[PDB]
Amino acid sequence: SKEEEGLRAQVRDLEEKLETLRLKRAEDKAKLKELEKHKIQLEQVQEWKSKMQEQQADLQRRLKEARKEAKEALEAKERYMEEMADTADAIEMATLDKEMAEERAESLQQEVEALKERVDELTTDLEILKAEIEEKGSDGAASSYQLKQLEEQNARLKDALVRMRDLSSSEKQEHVKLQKLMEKKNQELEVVRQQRERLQEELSQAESTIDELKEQVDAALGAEEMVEMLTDRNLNLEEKVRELRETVGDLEAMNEMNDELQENARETELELREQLDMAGARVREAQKRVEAAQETVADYQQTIKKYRQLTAHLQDVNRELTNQQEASVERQQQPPPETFDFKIKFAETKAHAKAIEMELRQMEVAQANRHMSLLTAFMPDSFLRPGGDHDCVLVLLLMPRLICKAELIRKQAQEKFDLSENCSERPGLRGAAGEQLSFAAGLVYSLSLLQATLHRYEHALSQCSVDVYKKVGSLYPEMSAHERSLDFLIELLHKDQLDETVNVEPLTKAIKYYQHLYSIHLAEQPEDSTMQLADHIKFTQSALDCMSVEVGRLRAFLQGGQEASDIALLLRDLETSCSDIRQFCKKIRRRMPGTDAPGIPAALAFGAQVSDTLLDCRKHLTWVVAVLQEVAAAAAQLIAPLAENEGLPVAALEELAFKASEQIYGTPSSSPYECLRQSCNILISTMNKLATAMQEGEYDAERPPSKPPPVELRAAALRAEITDAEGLGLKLEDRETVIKELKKSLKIKGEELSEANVRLSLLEKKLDSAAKDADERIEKVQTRLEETQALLRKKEKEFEETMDALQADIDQLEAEKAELKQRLNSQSKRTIEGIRGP
Amino acid sequence: SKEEEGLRAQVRDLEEKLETLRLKRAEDKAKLKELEKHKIQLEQVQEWKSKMQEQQADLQRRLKEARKEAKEALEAKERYMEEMADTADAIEMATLDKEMAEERAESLQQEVEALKERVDELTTDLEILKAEIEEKGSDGAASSYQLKQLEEQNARLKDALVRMRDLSSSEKQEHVKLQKLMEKKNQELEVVRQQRERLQEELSQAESTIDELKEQVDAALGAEEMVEMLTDRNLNLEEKVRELRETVGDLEAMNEMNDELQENARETELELREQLDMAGARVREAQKRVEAAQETVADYQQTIKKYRQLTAHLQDVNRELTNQQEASVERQQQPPPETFDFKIKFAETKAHAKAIEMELRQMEVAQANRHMSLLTAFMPDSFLRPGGDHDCVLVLLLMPRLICKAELIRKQAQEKFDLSENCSERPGLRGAAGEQLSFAAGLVYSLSLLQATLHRYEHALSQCSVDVYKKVGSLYPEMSAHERSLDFLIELLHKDQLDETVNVEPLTKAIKYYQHLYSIHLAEQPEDSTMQLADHIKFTQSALDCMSVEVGRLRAFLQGGQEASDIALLLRDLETSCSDIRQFCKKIRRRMPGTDAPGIPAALAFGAQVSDTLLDCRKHLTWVVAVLQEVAAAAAQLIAPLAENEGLPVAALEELAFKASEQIYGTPSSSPYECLRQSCNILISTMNKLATAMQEGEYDAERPPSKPPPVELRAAALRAEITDAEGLGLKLEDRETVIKELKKSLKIKGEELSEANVRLSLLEKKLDSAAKDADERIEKVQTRLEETQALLRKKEKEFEETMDALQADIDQLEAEKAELKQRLNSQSKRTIEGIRGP
């Protein structure tokens, strides 16, 4: 199927999605781990972020402070440069003035020193005196000439003195400037050394600060480590809280179903509890129905006691009125029981016994149906096919069943409507009571007709041929369909709804059908005279009941004062005829077979003319009943609008009788009076003759039981057909076995032939080659004998040479021994014969 | 198709799995959203952190500079107010130096004036000396002093030259030592400046390190704030995990009651439904009593109709006898005719239907009997023969019939004797009431056992083989004989004569019969687990009823005041064991198959171990019931002569209990106390285990496949053969022709084989004769050969013996020759030595 392939594709698709989304949840949990890492990092960057915000603010504030304090230091320094300007400008006058004063003093001092040198220079300027001096002579003046040369050398030296004095002054000035620059440099060196020591202290402070900050970072790393291990714990707990929340939701959902389920169970327990409150009242109210039917069984039993005491007392009063043969008249042969009482227990016992009986009967019915099914399983389809032997059996059952149903309806209808011989005198025949009685009588009449027809069927099928039996059986469906009119009537009786409003169309149709079918297929079957006559009596009695009821109704329809009218006389005559025919029926019934009383024959037999007379009697009875019923129906329609004290005119009833008689008898212009009178006269004469013949024993006969019924003949044929083919199967099995054994025997004994036949060939050849082989072992053995004899002769000469050689050796040895003895003697003799010279 | 439904179920399962892990995925992806904005704003706060670290670094730079600058501005102001002081001093003593230099210049001015006066004086004196020497001309002795002054001045001037040359060189020595003190101090200042610069660089590096460490400290101060964030969160989450786990536990716990309460509600519901089914069994029993009292009203109403017809007939006879005696007229009065005119009419409207139903059922029974007689007529003789298929069908019918009769009797007996669960507390258990209850309980127990056995029979025969079916059918007369034990009991119930005096041996004895016949012919047929369990429950309940009744009777038999004895509280223990086992039976019955209620399986299936356990349970039940019944019977006819106020001693009841316990349990010297208690413990344990396994569905199964009953196959076969048996005849004709041909072929090569065998025997006559002739001309030859061979061998020892003798005979001769030779040699030597004279 294509749908299977589509479902398989969707299964694979869903399985693949389940792989992918499981793998994705695994990835997606790992990715949640990345969430929690990012959360730690975000809290770290946020904490550093806020701390950073005031760190930046604090650095800005410190920068504000440091720059403000630097600017204030600069402002102080600047107002203070102003004070510098004042004092320094005052200095540079004062040094200008001191410097002019010092330069003036130094100029005056150099002029003082040059003037002292000029005083000495003038003492040497006495050198000028040379000119006056050497012009005078030679002793003192010319001596002063050399004096003056020395004096000029002096003047020469003095100038160099002055020059180096000036140079020394310059050097002194430079000296002072140098040493007081040096004082400045010492101050600078001291300041720089102090600044170096301050920088060393500040470096030591910063450097201790680095160490202390490292220590603080270590403690705060303890805090970070504290954070990380707190966070690991916290993430585990978050996962667990989340999972527990989900589980809590699931459990809440289960608990909520369980709460409806308990509520529904509680509602059902409440419903069962007032169902038990119902049912205790139902057991009490069915038990009140039980004590009520047990009070009805009570009162039925107190009234079977009251009818038992009443029947006992009426029997004792009757037996007292009969024991009255003598004056005594005083004997009640029964002790009075009381009321319900022992009878109570009798009926509770009988109800218990009847309950047991009904359970047993239900069990029997179920058993019969089961046995029925099991048996049906065993006989073949040819039996069960439509129109087969089963349908014929069903027909044989159908007629007794139909007869029984018709009898049940007839008896119940007679009892319910109190159909009695005196129905014509019942009050209220003009109204609904008359219609009810007419309906009941007609129903009983129709049922009697049906029963007679079915009795004919039963007899004919008990004695017909097998062919007719099968033909009737083939009609079983159609002629079983008509039972279901009678079933309708029985259902109406069961519901107490059988009344004059009931439609009897189907029953009449069924009767006509059965009569017609009998006329077609069973017409020349013989009839049973005994219960042909019994059925005739029953039919006649039912027809007479109908006739009497209709006569009474028609009399009630007549207007008062018309009793001397011609129709009223006819009605009275019909009533008298009814009584007479009923008396004849009773007379015939007394001699009817069935009881082992003296004078009653075992059976009846009469000729075909008696049967024809009975048919004619039935036809006339049917005509009279039909006429009366039609007239009464029309008259009832006419009388309905009339008052109770008003009646119909004889003219109207006469017209109705004219019409009905013409329609039913078929004879135009025949008076209904003398049609009906003729029919009744024929009936009276016929029953009178029949009653006389019966009383005289003219019809007495010995009783003709049916030959083996066609069903038994057919069953014997079917069993024979089954058997001498059922045994054929066993025969076939045996012939199977025989055939297998036989052809097995064929190969076995054929290949026994083949073996024997090879053996023939072999030992024919063996006989021939046995002649051959006998010859050739004879030659073998006889060659062997020759060879052995040849050895014997061989060995015999060899023996003989060996004998001869050994004997020669023995002879030679004996001769040699004798020769040695001779030689011994001869040597001894030669010794003494050699000494004697010749 | 099966596969489409399986695929749809798998699709549904896949879909639910995807939806569950999609919802877990969805929670996870909400958390992933949480991640994914956490990552966005981690990058945002990280850009922010890095950017503002840049800004902080710039601020740190600026603040370093500003501290630098404030320090330098303060130092400049301080040096500069040092300079204010220095400048004020310079002003003051520049003014003072101006005044000193002024009077110094004035003093030198006075000196200049005096020296210019002396220069004028010397010029005048030189002019005077000029005039004097111009006057003198001739001169003497005045040229000496000036000469001396002029060497002394040449020397003085050269010495003063050298003198303040030395002074200039000393000033330059001081000035050079000074200047090199400059240069050393400037180098010292340069070195201190270099040290200061290096210190300042190192301090700058240290300050950078300090700022970075301070910032680390900042981040980790934030970390401390997380430490206490996370600590609080972690405590709260631990508490929340604990609370969520507790809520999970609470929800699980009242889910657990909700399940238990649902089970208790179902149990109470079924007890209410058992009470509703005994209210409805009282409705069905009060019905069958209303139906029984209504067909009893129908029979009594037919009886009052017969009594009414008889009383009307007797009243008509008495009234014609009263025709001459009395006739009534009566004034106005309204006593209705007969106490039940419309009471009988109402019971007629109602159970007139019941009378009709009785008649219809009777004719249905007659029709069924006739129908199955007619059908039997068509059945072959092989079917109807003793041991045939008919007997097998009759077995299949007999044994459901037996079951139905069986609890008809059980069901009536329970009602009649009011066998209830509380029979142990009924008054009068010591007397006839106890005996009646014991009889009723035992009867119900036996009937339950019989029903269980027959149920096994029904199940086995529905599924056995045809062969087993056939021998079981062959035993039909024998098992059908046992039915009228039950028929006798139904007699007794119908007559209300079923009491404790009834002999139940035929029933027990039929039960034992059926128990073999099953053990022999149906032993390895499979059992129906469901209705095995159902029968076990029913049997156990009946046994418990017997059990309780006997316990109550034994308690009633005990002496007053012996309630504390071992036997009395053993009896109490047995009573509680009964109650517990009954509760387990109810539990099991609740989930038992048979109703279309949810949770009830279609069928039950359990292994052979469970079946064996059930058998053991039944065995122990039987033992305990038998012991109690035997003890109670013996005690009852020990207590009969005792007064109502007197009781049995515990010694007597114990001694009876010991006797019964041995000869039922078969174990000598075992205390009845352990035996009974152990049996009850086994029952309770097993029965509780079964209830539990039943309650969690361990035995649930579908109904097994229906497979054709042996009767069906047989029936089919029987009917089948009937059909094919037509064609079998044609086959038999063919097989017969084959057999005739096979036999003919067998005969021909039958006497071909015989002919070959004869020829074989004849030809190997020929060989044997030919062989014999050959053999005894052959024998004749090797007789000669054997004789020659024997001669050759014989004639060969004779040579060997002889020629050994010849060898010895030569060999003696050589010895004699040797002796003569050494005699000859001795004589020869004497001849030679005698020939040389000495």
Numbering used by the authors:
A (entry chain B), B (entry chain A): 214 to 1051
Reproduce the article's own wording on this structure:
Cytoplasmic dynein is a microtubule motor vital for cellular organization and division. It functions as a ~4 MDa complex containing its cofactor dynactin and a cargo-specific coiled-coil adaptor. The formation of dynein-dynactin-adaptor (DDA) complexes is a key regulatory step in dynein activation. Here, we determine the cryo-electron microscopy structure of dynein-dynactin on microtubules with LIS1 and the lysosomal adaptor JIP3.
Previous work showed CC1A and CC1B fold back on each other in isolated dynactin. We used AlphaFold2 together with previously published cryo-EM maps and crosslinking data to generate a model of the autoinhibited form of p150. In the inhibited p150 the ICD blocks dynein motor binding to CC1B, showing an unanticipated role for the ICD in p150 autoinhibition. The model further shows that the previously identified hairpin, formed by CC1A binding to CC1B, is incompatible with LIS1-N binding. In contrast, the DIC-N binding sites are partially accessible. Comparison of the two p150 states suggests that DIC-N binding destabilizes the autoinhibited p150 as one DIC-N copy partially clashes with the ICD whereas the other would displace CC1A. This implies DIC-N binding opens up CC1A/B to allow CC1B to bind LIS1 and the dynein motor. Comparison of p150’s inhibited and open conformations shows dynactin autoinhibition involves the previously identified CC1A/B hairpin and an additional interaction involving p150’s ICD domain. Both CC1A and ICD need to detach for CC1B to bind dynein’s motor and LIS1.
